[PDB]
Symmetry: C3
Subunit: 310 residues, 3 copies
């Protein structure tokens, strides 16, 4: 049980400052002590300085390529995370990456799939995060990682992203909790036949059935490695208020944590990302502690914590 | 795809002013643009002036027949809606009626069943709305439409209601979400063997199963037209605060919208009422926007809007 | 239909004052009138004066045996409840005990099992309440009743508890709603193979299935008497705020009441405890009325109240 907690305090994939404070905040809640208490030998991995990156972000509006914002900054930071995560996985350690906005998954997924080529990817999110370079309206890259990982709209992806290995195939990615998919993204999922389970399926079949379906969808070869990239805005805002893109009608706190227990239970989780925790985007301090403690909660449940004896 | 959005700004079926503001408020949210965006050719149908009706309502306390309040006013306005809706349906257009209190369903159901005689009726409500003329304690007619439509307690129904056609039979009406049924109403449902699915059934079988059961109950002849009269107080107040008769322990925002998607999915919806939205009965502006946007949301989901590609 | 509403205004099993106000508060809500309205012939049973007991509690910090706090006071009061409940059951009346903290279940369960020796026990709680004398960290006895009832850690249980009959066996107790079990308690449940259904099972199988499983687990001999000891902190705090030990991710108001209807429905309920309602631990008066009215609600549903005709 060797784990490396990758610190990825990046906010360049979106507009709002504060999300780079996620890593520090989670660690204050005692994320490492919790992992250690779950029997994991943990080591912290710092990939870059959040203050320096923030500084460079807030100032250079010139970093743009069309609607896309901060491709250069984003490309540089996610390559750093990729190299870190790839190394963490080669050393045989479990990489637990804490963001940071979801654009960091560009480096995490590439890093993990580079070592575990047949690893499936469960994207827990209210969003599909698969907008293409020329398709994105907002230009916020945290909503475009999967398009770049799948190499969609190749011809329009910047040179600064040339580093991204092409290891993820559409049949190895499954979504859970979708409810704010852009029209362009709907067409993409349908055309690539991506296994996507929206809140409709959860409402229709119950979370247990959805998680089972999602795991099977990316684990056909019998039983392969599984990676989970967890966007906290999947959870209904009334549970996760402090986030950049909240959408009502999401997972309940119970379903959000139950999903983790089911994944833990299958015993094939090889990596985990917990992203989009933005402490600054909270009304009261109640909103902050509820969101950050949720991040640590999914971490604990994903890493084996159960309600009863085990 | 021809639709007529029937505006029924009536509040005479209950005490609290404000519910007549529903139609306007929904339209401000962009109800028509949403329907148009769903591919519907929409036309607005104004049945009467809400200010004039309100004025006449707030002043004439003399309009009563026992406990029943405003039978004359109610009878005149609902006959107007009936004529409008009956015409809308004869023209082959889908009538989407926005209230207004639930007493308007006296005109909508009569209008629709007049054209689609074998149409089933799904009453989504926390209440049975079937109190008889001599049985009602409050005398508020928005809780008596189904008794008049089924012609119960004939001998005690006013002359001003002589216009109501007898087209709805007990075996063609199904309730979903019941939780505040009056004792008299419990006896009625049991005696007439009305298919009623309370929050107990939803809690017991899950919303998907209940909707399936409700649709089948009124669609025995194989597959007949279906009409839905949707009272927003079916949804738990913590989701729909701005309503006249809130009862805790109701449908979640997710179940409230999932039910719409399932009905849409069956492809036999022929009419829809969205009632009891009272903007004035809101604490903050957060309560208002949450309720009105919910009304538009059920409209969109009922009319085909899905989370994924379709 | 003969019922005795046992008043047990005790708070010695925990630190916070106010929980002894539960009985009075529930009765103000009209608990007795509700039971009478459900057809029960009710009689109130006062076991001791809450003001006198409170007075004696708040002053004597000397009443301790290790970490355990107020064993003498607790032992004296619960023996009183035991004698009352045992008598109520011998008279052939249904004992409905209103607390008071959960330490009162020491007297209720012993009283009921003394008359109905093969009675099963459903413990609805977020906690296992089975910490041993030498195992409890907090020393609060409201979290140790089941250890004393099962006679665990005999050698370390005070003399003042010598009165407790040994009538409850591990295979006749089932938990529902667990989510804050101490490590020592996890080991105990696992070693004694106690049927425990946590929020994981509710999330996994749905409340209906859990209640069915829980009833069967203690009713093997075909169909024996069933007793329910209901801790209101089983319900998610956002529904039951005014309680001493709230834990997020609990039962919804709907599941909390549905469980009661299912138990009522089986027709074998022989006793009921509604505990841990602490009116003083409420932010607004909204928190108070929501919690106390919940207590009366579970009472009504447990005693036969249904949403539809019955
Ligand atoms: N689809 C929107 C929102 C994406 C939100 C990104 B995420 O899932 O990481 O929060 C956009 O492209 O701007
Ligand atoms: N049953 C109550 C309340 C009826 C509520 C009407 B409705 O469902 O339209 O809100 C009454 O008769 O006054
Ligand atoms: N397990 C904790 C909390 C027990 C809570 C008791 B109860 O369930 O009655 O609220 C303790 O031993 O102090
Ligand atoms: Mn995301
Ligand atoms: Mn998202
Ligand atoms: Mn209604
Ligand atoms: Mn209603
Ligand atoms: Mn308890
Ligand atoms: Mn408890």
């Amino acid at each position: 049980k060797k784990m490396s907690i990758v610190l990825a305090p990046f906010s360049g994939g979106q507009p709002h400052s504060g999300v780079e404070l996620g890593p520090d905040y989670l660690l204050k809640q005692g994320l490492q002590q919790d992992m250690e208490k779950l029997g994991w030998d943990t080591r912290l991995e710092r990939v870059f300085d959040g203050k320096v990156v923030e500084a460079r972000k807030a100032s250079d509006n010139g970093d743009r390529i069309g609607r896309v914002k901060r491709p250069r900054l984003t490309a540089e930071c996610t390559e750093k995370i990729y190299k870190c995560v790839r190394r963490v996985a080669e050393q045989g350690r479990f990489p637990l990456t804490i963001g940071g906005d979801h654009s960091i998954a560009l480096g995490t997924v590439a890093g993990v799939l580079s070592v575990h080529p047949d690893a499936g990817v469960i994207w827990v999110d209210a969003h599909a995060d698969i907008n293409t370079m020329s398709g994105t309206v907002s230009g916020n890259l945290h909503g475009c990682p999967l398009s770049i990982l799948l190499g969609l709209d190749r011809e329009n992806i910047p040179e600064c992203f040339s580093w991204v290995p092409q290891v993820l195939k559409p049949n190895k990615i499954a979504y859970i909790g979708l409810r704010a998919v852009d029209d362009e993204e709907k067409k993409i999922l349908h055309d690539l036949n991506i296994a996507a389970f929206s809140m409709h399926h959860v409402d229709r079949y119950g979370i247990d059935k959805v998680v089972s379906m999602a795991i099977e969808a990316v684990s056909p070869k019998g039983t392969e490695p599984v990676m989970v990239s967890y966007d906290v805005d999947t959870i209904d805002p009334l549970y996760v208020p402090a986030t950049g893109t909240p959408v009502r009608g999401g997972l309940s706190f119970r379903e959000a944590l139950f999903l983790c227990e089911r994944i833990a239970e299958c015993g094939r989780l090889v990596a985990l990302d917990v992203v989009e925790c933005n402490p600054l985007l909270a009304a009261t301090e109640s909103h902050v502690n509820d969101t950050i403690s949720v991040g640590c909660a999914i971490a604990r449940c994903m890493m084996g914590e159960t309600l009863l004896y085990t």
